[PDB]
Design a protein around this ligand. Structure first.
Ligand SMILES: [Mg+2]
Ligand SMILES: [Mg+2]
Lengths: 155, 78, 206, 60, 24, 127, 98
RNA sequence: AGCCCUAGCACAGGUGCUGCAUGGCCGUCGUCAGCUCGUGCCGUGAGGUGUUGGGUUAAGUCCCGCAACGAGCGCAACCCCCGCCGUUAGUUGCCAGCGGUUCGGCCGGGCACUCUAACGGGACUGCCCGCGAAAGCGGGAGGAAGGAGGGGACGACGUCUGGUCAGCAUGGCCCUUACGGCCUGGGCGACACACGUGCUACAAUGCCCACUACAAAGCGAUGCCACCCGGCAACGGGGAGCUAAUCGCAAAAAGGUGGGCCCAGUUCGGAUUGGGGUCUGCAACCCGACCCCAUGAAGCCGGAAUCGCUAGUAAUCGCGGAUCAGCCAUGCCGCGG
């Protein structure tokens, strides 16, 4: 991206809750280009947040995501003599992606044997604020802050 | 792997059959290593070409359906 | 080592085939080998005419064979003493009955395939490799052409290090499809090795 | 051996398995298209001249 | 999958037919 | 009585006739939900109606062949939309903002020689 | 009821040479069901450009048979005249049917 | 006379060496925005100017400025495919509309539609806002398509004393009862090892089995093989149709729905080896592929390193073709989901 600053490839809204942010999530779940199975999974997962909690799936989803967004992180930096992990803020597009990336990953690391459950639990456990996603979130926030000394370069 | 004859060579039987009207030969040389060894035409030690020379192969009952070159190996220290 | 053949490139617009005969998947192989041994004997035993194209047509046992020259009569005789010999040689190998037109190009220093041979000839008669190119271009450029260019490969003047003299004039837009550029390639079997000669003549448009 | 070979490939042989194609022009054993008797080389050649009827450069 | 001649896939992939993939 | 559009989408062609009233939708001689069964996105193909408020107060008869199930799904979507502009001039001024009217130009780009696959080149080892 | 095939390499001179057969069968015949163009039979060859190892970089050649079809429902000898002989095809083939 | 046979002769023949003697053809820097000429001008001269500069572009693309004014090889454009609409045309489309339908667009009836294929139309920064001296840049309307709409073909002066005498052509040199020829067999397939490019997996976003038109390029008359029967099958019988928009290869597979396995080196994975057979071919030991029974290996996602791709792309799933008796194709060139 030398020339232009690149348009953020827009997404079709969801054909259910009508939310871009959902399809975004669905897309991350998708494997070999099998969007169908991908979608089934996320919806069937919203069903295991009825059967389990009185709450509306969307609200849980939103609120878990909001819980896994980092605020700070260490971007690497070379200077002629050593390597410096420099803490900068996180632009809202990156937040969006890291969170949704992390959820799926955190979720596929879980034990339960089935797609739609792993998604579901994670989603719940992280809107409570105790996800294995949320681990690899407070870690990043912590890694900055510990390198708070070098936080005076930030280019 | 075939099943309509045994695709064995003319020039070989001519020589085997008409050798067995009383015949006990080892000096019997051949280049037809693709000819199937024929039911019980044993005794006679055939000499098979491997590309360089003819090998003294004395033949027994238990080695029948096998083709002739399985005994004249074509390369060295294998 | 780049650059397409410019006839090949243009057999769409701007140039048609040296064989306008249809057919199908068991004759073509043979309707070809013949097509070739024809020009096989023609190109060898008719060099002096100076034969540019050797256009050909078919429709089952008839064959058009329109041989183009600008020495048209050197194919004939003085009435018909040779052109009879030839319809004879043709149909002897072609077990069929051969037509056999003859043609004149009103200007032979627009025939790339001649321009080449001419320059080629000279080279064997130990000529001036570089002023040949200089001349031949000016010849072709003289006959009102839009652009000309000639190329010799190498051992130019018997040299031990193979070289490449080229010369041009006016346009030769080798990248335009509506170009109409004739392309001539000639050999040159000298004592020390083979040279190679290329000819390019620009004319065309819309 | 390319001479005694080009000839022997015109013959009819003990057993028809021993047959084979061979660029009738550029006398050549390999890559000889069945619809031409023509080595891909001695071919890209004629094709470019136009000596090959109806054969165009493809593009899509 | 694609390497077991005794799966169906095994035979699609190989292109062949038989017990484990018959011709309709 | 009748209306028409011709939807197309990447080797897929959509013959579409609507009729007023009911809500049912026959597609290649089948109910919508028999042809598009489990295929979670199909509900979108009839999105152009939900756009105009003709919710399910047309029937529609639809042949659709060529290529792909999901390409068909989008193909139809173009008919269902190109049909109603031709049963109301003003069916336009609120289908453009959503653009159910663009063809969708995109298509299997070509396999180039030397690549594996159009764009995917092979694997450089360098030593 | 006449059914005549027209095969070709040259697209422009089937639609040319065999649209004399939509005139010389209209002027001295009567009814004509126009030319119908049958899908083309494209024969692709693909050659490695050089004489040696350069297995990438190739050229593409296709020789394409254009197929054309003609039906006319007034079979007179009023027609078998220019349609007996009066020519402008030169690399065409024709199947005559009924 | 020819033509043939032996004894001579002139000659043939050599994939024998030289790509550092060559031609032709290819690859490479690189589809990079460059490389030059004519005349004028500056400089004793090699050379310079032009081609630098400021704005702009994908670009030596354009613009404004300037001792230069122009031009040539390049770039773009002229050709092919893909997108939208029209014209022409009915042994492929069809109740689209009505009649008959043993309910197979099959039977009349019709090209409306789809399509097949030939020609045309369409996009130009043309329109409105804003900035600018201009070129043009940011937005918006219209429109199937906006600002190069998406893919090709197309490779400048030249560089790598790049590649190839084994495709062919060719100077030179070396063999000419043999460095030529013809055959039978063997080798190009060897195996302590080591790199490249791939294929197949290591699983549950999975495997298996049953059913279930989403079709989108090609090949076929010393052939494609519908359909029958025999065989668990490979395949073998009989046998129809189509010189093939008509008949055949042809089932697309992922997908959908049902069922099953329950985290196991497993109903994951199919290497190895044993056996019995099919086919092509004079012939399948070395050296074919296919079918079936058994045998089931390593592999639980890979160190330091390192490859590809910016959109219908990558990832994933099948389809065909070329050469070809058959085939060691998991390769190659192509098609779509
Ligand atoms: Mg000075
Ligand atoms: Mg080898």
């Amino acid at each position: 991206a030398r020339r232009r600053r690149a348009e953020v490839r827009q997404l079709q809204p969801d054909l259910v809750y009508g939310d871009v942010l959902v399809t975004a999530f669905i897309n991350k779940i998708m494997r070999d280009g099998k969007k169908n199975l991908a979608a089934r999974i996320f919806y069937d997962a919203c069903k295991i947040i009825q059967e389990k909690t009185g709450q509306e799936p969307l609200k849980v989803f939103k609120q878990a995501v909001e819980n896994v967004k980092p605020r700070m992180e260490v971007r690497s930096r070379r200077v002629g003599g050593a390597n410096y992990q420099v803490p900068m803020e996180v632009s809202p597009r990156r937040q969006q992606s890291l969170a949704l990336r992390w959820l799926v990953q955190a979720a596929n690391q879980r034990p339960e044997r089935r797609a739609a459950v792993r998604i579901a639990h994670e989603l719940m456990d992280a809107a409570e604020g105790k996800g294995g996603a949320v681990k690899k979130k407070e870690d990043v926030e912590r890694m900055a802050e510990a390198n708070r000394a070098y936080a005076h370069y930030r280019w | 792997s075939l099943k309509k004859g045994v695709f064995v060579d003319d020039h070989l039987l001519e020589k085997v059959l008409e050798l067995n009207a009383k015949g006990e030969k080892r000096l019997i040389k051949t280049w037809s290593r693709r000819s199937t060894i024929v039911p019980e035409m044993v005794g006679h030690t055939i000499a098979v070409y491997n590309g360089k020379q003819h090998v003294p192969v004395y033949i027994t009952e238990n080695m029948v359906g096998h083709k002739l070159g399985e005994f004249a190996p074509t390369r060295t220290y294998r | 080592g780049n650059k397409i053949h410019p006839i090949g490139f243009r057999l769409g617009i701007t140039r048609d085939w040296e064989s306008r005969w249809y057919a199908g998947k068991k004759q073509y192989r043979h309707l070809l080998l013949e097509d070739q041994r024809i020009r096989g004997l023609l190109e060898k035993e008719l060099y002096s005419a100076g034969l540019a194209r050797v256009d050909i047509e078919r429709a089952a046992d008839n064959v058009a064979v329109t041989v183009h020259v600008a020495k048209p009569g050197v194919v004939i005789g003085r009435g018909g003493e040779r052109i009879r010999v030839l319809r004879e040689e043709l149909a002897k190998l072609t077990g069929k009955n051969v037509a056999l037109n003859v043609q004149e190009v009103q200007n032979p220093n627009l025939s790339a395939p001649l321009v080449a041979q001419r320059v080629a000839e000279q080279i064997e008669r130990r000529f001036a490799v570089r002023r040949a190119i200089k001349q031949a271009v000016q010849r072709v450029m003289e006959s009102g052409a839009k652009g000309a260019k000639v190329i010799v490969s190498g051992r130019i003047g018997g040299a031990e290090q193979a070289r490449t003299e080229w010369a041009a004039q006016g346009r030769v837009p080798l990248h335009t499809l509506r170009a109409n550029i004739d392309y001539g390639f000639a050999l040159a079997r000298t004592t020390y090795g083979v040279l190679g000669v290329k000819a390019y003549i620009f004319l065309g448009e819309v | 051996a390319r001479k005694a070979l080009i000839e022997k490939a015109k013959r009819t042989p003990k057993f028809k398995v021993r047959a084979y194609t061979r660029c009738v022009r550029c006398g050549r054993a390999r890559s000889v298209y069945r619809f031409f008797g023509l080595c891909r080389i001695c071919l890209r050649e004629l094709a470019h001249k136009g000596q090959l009827p109806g054969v165009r450069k493809a593009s899509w | 999958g694609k390497g077991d001649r005794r799966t169906r896939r095994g035979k699609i992939w190989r292109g062949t037919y038989g017990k484990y993939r018959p011709r309709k | 009585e009748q209306y028409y559009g011709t939807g197309r989408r990447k080797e897929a062609v959509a013959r579409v006739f609507l009729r007023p009233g009911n809500g049912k939708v026959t597609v290649n001689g089948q109910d919508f939900n028999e042809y598009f069964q489990g295929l979670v996105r199909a509900v979108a193909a009839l999105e152009p109606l939900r756009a105009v408020d003709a919710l399910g107060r047309f029937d529609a008869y639809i042949t659709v062949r060529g290529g792909g199930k999901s390409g068909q799904i989008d193909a139809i979507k173009l008919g269902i939309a190109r049909a109603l502009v031709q049963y109301n001039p003003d069916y336009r001024a609120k289908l453009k903002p959503l653009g159910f009217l663009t063809r969708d130009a995109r298509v299997v780009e070509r396999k180039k020689y030397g690549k594996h696959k159009a764009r995917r080149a092979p694997q450089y080892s360098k030593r | 009821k006449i059914r005549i095939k027209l095969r070709g390499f040259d697209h422009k001179t089937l639609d040319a040479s065999a649209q004399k057969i939509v005139e010389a069968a209209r002027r001295s015949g009567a009814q004509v069901s126009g030319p119908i163009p049958l899908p083309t039979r494209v024969r692709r060859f693909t050659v490695i450009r050089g004489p040696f190892k350069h297995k990438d970089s190739r050229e593409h050649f296709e020789l394409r048979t254009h197929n054309r079809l003609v039906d006319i429902i007034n079979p007179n000898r009023k027609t078998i005249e220019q349609l007996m002989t009066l020519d402008l095809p030169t690399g065409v083939e024709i199947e005559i049917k009924t």
